Structure 1
Amino acid sequence: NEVVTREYTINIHKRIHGVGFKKRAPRALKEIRKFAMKEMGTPDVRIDTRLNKAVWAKGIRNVPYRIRVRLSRKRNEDEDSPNKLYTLVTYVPVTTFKNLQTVNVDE
C-alpha cells in the first residue's frame, strides 16, 4: 500500500504546449515533478539522472512527446524528514507508445 512501484506514460506535449524555446525542457521536468506529486501525495520527489538524459536527449526545444516512467513510492531512509515517504522517478526505455496502459507492476 505504501511501497508501490508502478508504470505510467506521461504525455509531455499537452503540458509543454504554450512555452517558449529556451523554457521547454525545464518546464517539462517541472510538470513531471507535478505529475509525481499529483498521483503520489509526497512532496519529496527525487527524479533520476537517466530520465534527465532521456528528456534532454534531443535538445532544449524539441522535447519528446510521450515518455515512460516507473514511479515508486518508497519509505524514507536516514536523514529523516517531516515528509514520511519519498517518490523515486525512473525512465523506462520503450520503443513505441501504442496501447501502453498504466501497468501496476509487482515487487
Structure 2
Amino acid sequence: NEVVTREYTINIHKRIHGVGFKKRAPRALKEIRKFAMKEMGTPDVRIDTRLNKAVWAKGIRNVPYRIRVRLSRKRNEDEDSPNKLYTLVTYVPVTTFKNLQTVNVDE
C-alpha cells in the first residue's frame, strides 16, 4: 500500500551525539526529517508543530534522547506538484520507551 501509517521510535541521542550546544535541536529536526525520508521514501516531509515543540521542549541543547513519532504517508494529490506523496510526522507522547517496537497503525 501507499497510504500507510506507522509508529516508530527515534534515537535522537544517537543521531545528535557530538553536535554542539547551539545546534542540537535544529540538527534533531534535520535528523527527524532525514529519518522520515529514509523510512517512507518521500522527499516531501512535513513535521507537526506539536512534534517541533516536543523536540524543543527542553531547550536548544538538552534534546530528549528518544522520541516516539508517527509517520503517515498521505496523498499530495491536491495540486500540480512534482511529488504525489508526502509524509506527515506527528508526536506520540509515551511514558516509557521500553519494549516499544515499530508498529503498523490502522486508520
TM-score by length of structure 2 reads 0.97
Partner Cα distance (1:31, 1:62) in 2: 16
Report the 3-state secondary structure (helix = DSSP H, G, I; strand = E; otherwise coil) of the residue aligned with 1:104: strand
CA displacement at 1:84 relative to structure 2 = 1.4
% identical equivalent positions: 100
Deviation at 1:79, TM superposition (A): 2.8
Shift of 1:24: 0.3
Greater CA drift, 71-80 or 95-104: 71-80
Deviation track 1:30-87 (CA, whole Å, cap 9, x = no partner) reads: 0000000001111000010000110000100100001000100001142331111000
What residue ranges of structure 2 are gaps of 5+ in the alignment?
Answer: none
**C-alpha contact (below 8 Å) 2:77/2:84 kept by paired residues:** no
Work out the number of aligned pairs and report it: 107
Residues of 1 paired with 2:79 and 2:37: CA distance? 21
The alpha carbon displacement at 1:10 in A equals 0.3
The answer to whether the Cα contact below 8 Å between 2:25 and 2:56 also exists between their aligned partners in 1 is yes
Task: State the TM-score, normalized to the length of structure 1.
Answer: 0.97
Task: Tell me, yes or no, if the aligned pair for 2:42 and 2:86 is still in contact at 8 Å.
Answer: yes
- Shift, 1:106, TM fit: 1.1
